Amino acid sequence: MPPYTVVYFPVRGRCAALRMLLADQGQSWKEEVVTVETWQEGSLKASCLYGQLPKFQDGDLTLYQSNTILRHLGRTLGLYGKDQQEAALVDMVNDGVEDLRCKYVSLIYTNYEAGKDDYVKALPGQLKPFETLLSQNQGGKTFIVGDQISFADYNLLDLLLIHEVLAPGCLDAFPLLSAYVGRLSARPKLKAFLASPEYVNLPINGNGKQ
Amino acid sequence: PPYTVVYFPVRGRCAALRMLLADQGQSWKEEVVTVETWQEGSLKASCLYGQLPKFQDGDLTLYQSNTILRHLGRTLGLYGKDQQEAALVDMVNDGVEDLRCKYVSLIYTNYEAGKDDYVKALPGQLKPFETLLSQNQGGKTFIVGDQISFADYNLLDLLLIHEVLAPGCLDAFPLLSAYVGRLSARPKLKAFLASPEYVNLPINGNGKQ
Numbered sequence: 001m002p003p004y005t006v007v008y009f010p011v012r013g014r015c016a017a018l019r020m021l022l023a024d025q026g027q028s029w030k031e032e033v034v035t036v037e038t039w040q041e042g043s044l045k046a047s048c049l050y051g052q053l054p055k056f057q058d059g060d061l062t063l064y065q066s067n068t069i070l071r072h073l074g075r076t077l078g079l080y081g082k083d084q085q086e087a088a089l090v091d092m093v094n095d096g097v098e099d100l101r102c103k104y105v106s107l108i109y110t111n112y113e114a115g116k117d118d119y120v121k122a123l124p125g126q127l128k129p130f131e132t133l134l135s136q137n138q139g140g141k142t143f144i145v146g147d148q149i150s151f152a153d154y155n156l157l158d159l160l161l162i163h164e165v166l167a168p169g170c171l172d173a174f175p176l177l178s179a180y181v182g183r184l185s186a187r188p189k190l191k192a193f194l195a196s197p198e199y200v201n202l203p204i205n206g207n208g209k210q
Numbered sequence: 211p212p213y214t215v216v217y218f219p220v221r222g223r224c225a226a227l228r229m230l231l232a233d234q235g236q237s238w239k240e241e242v243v244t245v246e247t248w249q250e251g252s253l254k255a256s257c258l259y260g261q262l263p264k265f266q267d268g269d270l271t272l273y274q275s276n277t278i279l280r281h282l283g284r285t286l287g288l289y290g291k292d293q294q295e296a297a298l299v300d301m302v303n304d305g306v307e308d309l310r311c312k313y314v315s316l317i318y319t320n321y322e323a324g325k326d327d328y329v330k331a332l333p334g335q336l337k338p339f340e341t342l343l344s345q346n347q348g349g350k351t352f353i354v355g356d357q358i359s360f361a362d363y364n365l366l367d368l369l370l371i372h373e374v375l376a377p378g379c380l381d382a383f384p385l386l387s388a389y390v391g392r393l394s395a396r397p398k399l400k401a402f403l404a405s406p407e408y409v410n411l412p413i414n415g416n417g418k419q
C-alpha cells in the first residue's frame with residue numbers, strides 16, 4: 001500500500017496543492033474521503049488534534065495542518081531550496097500565500113455576495129509581491145525561489161488557479177505570473193493530474209461558491 | 211549583532227522571536243518604527259507584503275514572523291532532532307498561529323463586544339496543547355522531543371498573553387501551567403522577561419490586552 005494517506009472532505013480546498021505535489025513528484029497516496037455526514041456524527045472530529053482536516057499519515061506519523069504537511073513533503077522529497085537561505089525564502093513565500101489564502105477562504109465562507117467586488121478591486125496589490133519575487137529570480141523564467149521547484153510553487157500555483165476562477169483574467173496585469181502558471185501547468189505529470197476526473201470533478205470549496 | 215529586528219514599539223509578533231534570541235544568548239539590534247514614520251509611506255512600500263516585522267541576518271532580509279522563527283530554528287538547531295520531530299514542531303507552531311490570529315482579531319475588531327464569548331471558548335482552544343504535552347514524556351520537557359524548539363517560544367508567548375487577557379485561564383491545565391513555570395525560569399529567559407525592553411512595551415498596537 002502507498003506510505004501516504006490523505007483524509008479530507010471531497011473538495012480541493014486545503015489539499016489541492018499537496019495532491020499536485022505528490023502527483024508531480026510521481027508518488028502514490030490513498031485518499032480516505034470523509035463526507036459531511038460522517039463529520040457531523042462527531043467521532044472523527046473529536047479524534048483530530050485541532051478538530052479539523054486535513055489529516056495526513058506517512059507510515060505511522062500522523063499530521064494535521066495543511067502547511068505542516070507541505071513542509072514535511074518538502075523536506076522528505078527534497079523540495080525545500082538547496083541551502084538554508086533558499087529554505088528561508090521558500091518559507092517567506094508560503095507564508096504570503098497562506099495570508100492571501102486566509103482572506104480568500106474568509107470571503108467564500110463569510111462575505112461572498114457583499115465582498116466579492118471589494119476583494120477583487122484589492123487583488124492586484126495582493127498579487128504584486130509574487131510578481132516582484134519572480135522578477136528578482138532569474139527574470140521570472142524558472143520557479144519562485146532558486147532554480148528547482150519547491151513546495152511553495154505548488155501552493156502558489158493553486159492559489160493563482162483559484163483566483164483565476166474567482167476573478168477571470170486577474171493575472172492579465174501580471175506577465176511573469178501569467179507565464180509562470182502556464183509553464184508549471186504544462187509539467188507532464190501535473191498537466192495529466194490537472195485534467196483528470198479526480199481533480200476536475202471535485203469542487204474548489206465546501207459550500208460550492210467559487 | 212548579526213541581527214536586526216524592525217518593528218513597531220510593541221511586543222506583538224516579535225515577542226516570541228525576541229524571547230528566542232534572548233534565551234539563546236544571541237545579540238541583536240532593534241530598529242524601532244513609530245507610527246509616524248510608518249504612515250509617511252517610504253518603508254512600507256519597500257516592505258515585500260507591506261508589513262513588519264522585517265529582519266536582517268547579515269545580507270539576508272526576511273519578512274513574515276513565522277519565517278523568521280523557522281530561520282532561527284534551522285540555523286540555531288531549534289527544529290527537532292530529525293525529520294519526524296521537525297514535522298511535529300511545525301504542527302504545533304501552525305496551531306499556535308491559528309489561535310494567535312483569532313486573538314489578534316479579538317483585539318483589533320471585536321474587543322468590547324466579543325471578549326466574553328472568546329474566553330468561554332478558550333479552554334477548547336488550549337486543550338490540544340495540554341494533550342500534546344501529555345504525549346511527550348508526560349509533559350515534563352518541551353512541546354516536542356527533549357530539546358527546546360522555536361515552537362516552544364511561540365507557544366510560551368501565546369500562553370503568557372492569554373494569562374493577561376483571561377487571568378487564571380491555565381488553572382485547569384496542569385501540564386500547561388507547569389510548562390509556563392519551567393520555561394519562564396530558564397536563566398537567560400527569566401532575565402529578559404523582567405527587563406524594561408520587554409516589560410515596558412505594550413502587547414498590542416491599540417493598547418488593548
Ligand SMILES: N[C@@H](CCC(=O)N[C@@H](CS[C@@H]1c2ccccc2-c2ccccc2[C@H]1O)C(=O)NCC(=O)O)C(=O)O
Pocket residue numbers: 009011013014045051052053054064065066067105109204205206207304308
Ligand atoms: N489550519 C488548518 C485549517 C484547516 C481547516 O480549515 N479545515 C476545515 C476544512 S478546509 C475548508 C473549510 C474552511 C472553513 C470552513 C469550512 C471548510 C470546509 C467544510 C467542509 C468541507 C470542506 C471545507 C473546506 O472548504 C475543517 O476542517 N472544517 C471542519 C470543522 O472545522 O469542523 C490547515 O491549514 O490544515
Ligand SMILES: N[C@@H](CCC(=O)N[C@@H](CS[C@@H]1c2ccccc2-c2ccccc2[C@H]1O)C(=O)NCC(=O)O)C(=O)O
Pocket residue numbers: 095099218220222223254260261262263273274275276314318413414415416
Ligand atoms: N503574516 C505577517 C503579519 C504581519 C502583520 O500583521 N504586521 C502588522 C503589525 S503586527 C500587529 C498588528 C496586527 C493587526 C493590525 C495592526 C497591527 C499593528 C499596528 C501597529 C503597531 C503594531 C501592530 C501589531 O499589533 C503591520 O505591519 N501592520 C501595519 C500596516 O500593515 O500598515 C507576519 O506574521 O509577520
